[PDB]
Ligand binder design. Structure first.
Ligand SMILES: C[C@@H](OP(=O)(O)OP(=O)(O)OP(=O)(O)OC[C@H]1O[C@@H](n2cnc3c(=O)[nH]c(N)nc32)[C@H](O)[C@@H]1O)c1ccccc1[N+](=O)[O-]
Ligand SMILES: C[C@@H](OP(=O)(O)OP(=O)(O)OP(=O)(O)OC[C@H]1O[C@@H](n2cnc3c(=O)[nH]c(N)nc32)[C@H](O)[C@@H]1O)c1ccccc1[N+](=O)[O-]
Ligand SMILES: [Mg+2]
Ligand SMILES: [Mg+2]
Lengths: 166, 166
């Protein structure tokens, strides 16, 4: 079967694990997921295609020096996740994207911008802000909540279709 | 607010109305929807943007001669719908797409390919077939079911993001 190697990426705290656990095990992690080389494998059917999702749920903080380069090399598509109540994690996206571009030696890698925790009242990054960063990268922007499951399958499935047209 | 003028298009029978009724009124129409200039208007929030969906649910059969040209001129994005248990409706998609291209005077119009009725056992058009037609057009392919609500918000929201990057 077609297999898709997806890497979830973003700053410490933004909900990388909670998005993945919500997709694979169907529940919201208020606990601390393992967050090193966490790999999840799932047979799914996406638009009628039977396919294997192999996702790497990555660590945030930049002790991940060139161990990023390793897992970025192998990844076909990347979810780039920030949290809508944290502008630093948004600012940081630019850094994750360049590092990906640097390692893939390409200006266009399958990639989705995901503004997570959209269930929270107190957002510090307006959708418009992120919408027009995505526009600026030429990639979809999707808002999610791992807590309510909103946008979750959207974000993951959109990325899989991004890889399909590549 | 940002408003998005969407036109649902496809051959007689494929589920154009049932997709729209499922999005707007949240239930599956086993009855005969009105199917002429059916317009639905809904305030929705898509990825954190408050926006107005104005959808034209169109008639299938080609008594719609140049009255197509009218509503195709004004449409920003099109859902192009076939039914996965009918190869003629699939074959027909090419005709809807050219007519759109002819009227918009453009090779790329915001557009999604939707293979509807994916809840049915007896499909005559494999996903791969359609996947690689979509690839051939450079547009997303999404499988739906108006009956089970599968893929419905996916299809409609993906098209709205298609228009956003235009
Ligand atoms: C060690 C490093 O961990 P990390 O791996 O960089 O952190 P993650 O990005 O994996 O983030 P995780 O999935 O662990 O979720 C973080 C917190 O935000 C909450 N959260 C995630 N998604 C949502 C959502 O949509 N809604 C709401 N309301 N909350 C959500 C979680 O329940 C959790 O308490 C990390 C770094 C800095 C701070 C935290 C942090 N951490 O793991 O706790
Ligand atoms: C007049 C013209 O009508 P039309 O407007 O071209 O037809 P539509 O494309 O709007 O199609 P509609 O939404 O009316 O649904 C058609 C039939 O398929 C069923 N259907 C739609 N979506 C699904 C789904 O996902 N699952 C299942 N199981 N069935 C689904 C409906 O319940 C209905 O019985 C038309 C033309 C030819 C044939 C029929 C036809 N018609 O309206 O009945
Ligand atoms: Mg984690
Ligand atoms: Mg109809």
């Amino acid at each position: 079967m077609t297999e898709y190697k997806l890497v979830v990426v973003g700053a410490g705290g933004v909900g990388k694990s909670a998005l993945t656990i919500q997709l694979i095990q169907n529940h919201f992690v208020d606990e601390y997921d393992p967050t090193i080389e966490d790999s999840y494998r799932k047979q799914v059917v996406i638009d009628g295609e039977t396919c294997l999702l192999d996702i790497l749920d990555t660590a945030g903080q930049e002790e991940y020096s060139a161990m990023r380069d390793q897992y970025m090399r192998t990844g076909e598509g990347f979810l780039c996740v920030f949290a809508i109540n944290n502008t630093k994690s948004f600012e940081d996206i630019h850094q994750y994207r360049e590092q990906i571009k640097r390692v893939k030696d390409s200006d266009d890698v399958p990639m989705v911008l995901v503004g997570n925790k959209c269930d929270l009242a107190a957002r510090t990054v307006e959708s418009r802000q992120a919408q027009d960063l995505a526009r600026s990268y030429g990639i979809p922007y999707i808002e999610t909540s791992a807590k309510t499951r909103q946008g979750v399958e959207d974000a993951f499935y959109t990325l899989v279709r991004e890889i399909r047209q590549h």
